[PDB]
């Protein structure tokens, strides 16, 4: 059978979003009992962000240039402060759709659910993950600025990013909910390089457990390899070096399947050297890196 | 750039999944207004579904043996009736969340949007296409039983699917809200043949639209093509033909890029022939036909 990248369910999201305006810069903020969290260059036209001073910017702002609107309701805005590259909306009113939540800063290779939206409004969703060089993959409407990425763990909903940017190479980078860059990039116009994206090689190995137990089998061998030796052939593909810990949490993968995870480094190994030979994995003819140990083993 | 496959922000449908039990059997229903909806082999065990007369063995039902929950909170069904191959119990509560909806029956070729479900609380959300043969690609939980598809059109939720049935090929059949099935298909455990699952040709080409959108030009050429001649090199690969009605709703697209359909048609002719040569489109080694020309337009 198939196997699909699926996103958390956006509902106690989608009721947080809301649409901010300074002037002729409108983006999507996230109202959180009476506060707005939006990217603080909405207070800049595109001309300042070549080199902008925010803090004389956000000076010469007063409340009512900041226009709140969530849905079709405008929301009074009574204060204005800013941490790191966050701008905090004060508002009159408590968003009484406001989920449990926490606020949380993920790590290089992990997945989260991004809900799309435009002008405030809530246009999709979809899963992604994080790369090793802390940018996100994805279309200008994918990251439009202020959508956030979250994970939902029972009733809490863990926001963990937040869209600021798109770099001149066409993707994405953006902060966690306190206002801190993943990466090295600012929120400023300057040509910024990311550094080097790597194959995520746990994420790999995971969804080539979903793919046997799915079903596909054709890439599994009787051959063996030990962890140095698979490492030596990732480093030359640009995957990710794998450690123990990785192999220890693929464990429930490797129980359930009956396939020893260094077995599957050299089915993976095997791949790498010959490709497919025109055969595909759950439909896909490249090895893919977006399903982390955790997601195979809710979705199977 | 990147360009994602976005499914529809769910929280419209969240508030109407409820989880119906009869005996050992567990599925996921749709309660809309005083009705819940679900798949009607709820009232069969297993042993009953090789060839279940279903007006029987509701007959032997009592209301209190469907065990309603709607998180937490039990529903009281005061009543019972089958509509095709759908069950509607009647329930003394109209649900508060009940959005503004519609049922509708879709076209192959379509997408929309999965609401995945566990035992009557949303697990997550997808993106898919209805094939030419009436069969939606996924994993058993991507179509646990009960699950709807749904397209949002402003304000309204427009139901048009029901997870019913995987056929022992992994692939999985269903309904639309009143109970009548897509394809060939009935709920019974038979071995069911689908049809020839054909490329859906007008997606394949709306996804060339996007990806030179994004950047990606290296499939462009100079060659021309007419619609017959490009139909015999379709049909070669089981590509589904491309019809004027077809090339009409390519139109925006085209205006868009200044590419002309016949023009993008001609390219699509040379990779079906030559491949790709070690190259990708919009990250893939493949050609995407899961987005539709609408769905296009609306994300770029």
Chains 1, 2 share one sequence.
């Not at 590259?85 to 659910?113: E, H, W």
């Not at 400023?188 to 390089?193: E, F, G, L, W």
């Not at 046997?212 to 070096?241: H, Q, S």
Request: hydrophobic letters at 35%; aromatic letters at 10%.
């Amino acid at each position: 059978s198939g196997f699909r990248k699926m996103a958390f369910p956006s509902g106690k999201v989608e009721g947080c979003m809301v649409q901010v305006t300074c002037g002729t810069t409108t983006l999507n903020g996230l109202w959180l009992d009476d506060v707005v969290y939006c990217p603080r260059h909405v207070i800049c036209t595109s001309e300042d962000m070549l080199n902008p001073n925010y803090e004389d910017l956000l000076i010469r702002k007063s409340n009512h240039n900041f226009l709140v609107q969530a849905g079709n309701v405008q929301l009074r805005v009574i204060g204005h402060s800013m941490q790191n590259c966050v701008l905090k909306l004060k508002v009159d009113t408590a968003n009484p759709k406001t989920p449990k939540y926490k606020f949380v800063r993920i790590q290089p290779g992990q997945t989260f659910s991004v809900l799309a939206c435009y002008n405030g409004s809530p246009s999709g969703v979809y899963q992604c993950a994080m790369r090793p060089n802390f940018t996100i993959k994805g279309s200008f409407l994918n990251g439009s600025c202020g959508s956030v990425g979250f994970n939902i763990d029972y009733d809490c909903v863990s926001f963990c990013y937040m869209h600021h940017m798109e770099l001149p190479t066409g993707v994405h980078a953006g902060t966690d909910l306190e206002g801190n860059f993943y990466g090295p990039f600012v929120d400023r116009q300057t040509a910024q390089a990311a550094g080097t994206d790597t194959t995520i090689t746990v994420n790999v190995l995971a969804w080539l457990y979903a793919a046997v137990i799915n079903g596909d089998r054709w890439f599994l061998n009787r051959f063996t390899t030990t962890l140095n030796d698979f490492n030596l052939v990732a480093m030359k593909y640009n995957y990710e070096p794998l450690t123990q810990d990785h192999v220890d949490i693929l464990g429930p993968l490797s129980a359930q399947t009956g396939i020893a995870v260094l077995d599957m480094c050299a089915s993976l190994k095997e791949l790498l050297q010959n490709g497919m030979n025109g055969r595909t994995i759950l439909g896909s003819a490249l090895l893919e890196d977006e399903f982390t140990p955790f997601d195979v083993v809710r979705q199977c």
